[PDB]
Amino acid sequence: AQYEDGKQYTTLEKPVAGAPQVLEFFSFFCPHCYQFEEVLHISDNVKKKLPEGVKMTKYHVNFMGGDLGKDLTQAWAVAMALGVEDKVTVPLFEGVQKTQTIRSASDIRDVFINAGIKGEEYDAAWNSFVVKSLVAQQEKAAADVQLRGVPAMFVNGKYQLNPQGMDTSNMDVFVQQYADTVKYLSEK
Template structure:
């Protein structure tokens, strides 16, 4: 009886291993020239991007994936500055949000202001969103002009170039792999989100 049990456990382990194995070119792509010193899980997005809006605000894929990451693995988000008339200002504002640790507060407001109400048209409108979310005007202005924010802007721009970013939303793992969004299971939103998380965990384990 014990022998049969161990055989069954062995079969289950094989199926488990197969279930967590993914194929290059189908669920992910390997980058020709791996980027150096990038966060382990890095997402690029734009507040102007309708797909990013759905990804973040409708289906909450980023937050669901973030919760499923292994302990100690952080998900970092960078803004792409070449989309939209105030794309560069939004990237700098995102650097302010990163510096102040208020990404989750301002992200929904910025998305809504650009995708739904379309009442964000100038850098001053962006500033008003931060104030609306509880950030003091003086704190925002100080951060906006700080050396740290300028450094974060450059870091986002350099990462986009190093990873040869072609579009958003895009998620990169260890600077070596990119998730192929259209290669995931789209039979349901849960299946898509779960496989997204599984592919990330699989790629994090690759050497």
């Protein structure tokens, strides 16, 4: 076939019921994730090719960057709860990997403050039980597919994108191939 199990995607031996339709995992410590965000705009290009009625989910993971890696998963929960993902994603990636100015929870917080979220609003969110359950959801979704690598994308809790099996001569071509694959898996 043109799309083949083990080529552009793999199948989960243990499918995850009730899983989000399009579920992406990343870490602000993850070099390919930086690329996926800043250079390739993967999430964005997938969305433009997804059918009507499909929801897109993106979660942070703990297993990179130790203590700071966990802080970042809680901060991403804050970002989701406040709806400010699109204002902090780029400065978080650059603060962690480019300028290396993020070294503590306080520096993460500075990024939100500079993005215009208020101190009081950030700290309240940070400490809220709504953010706690949001952290739990990120961990549970990663746990369900026993996730040991990022970037990662899963479609309908059954299929896993396999970017290694796509050409990287050309970044635009890699992205379209990636997105068409999601669309194909989406319709499966």
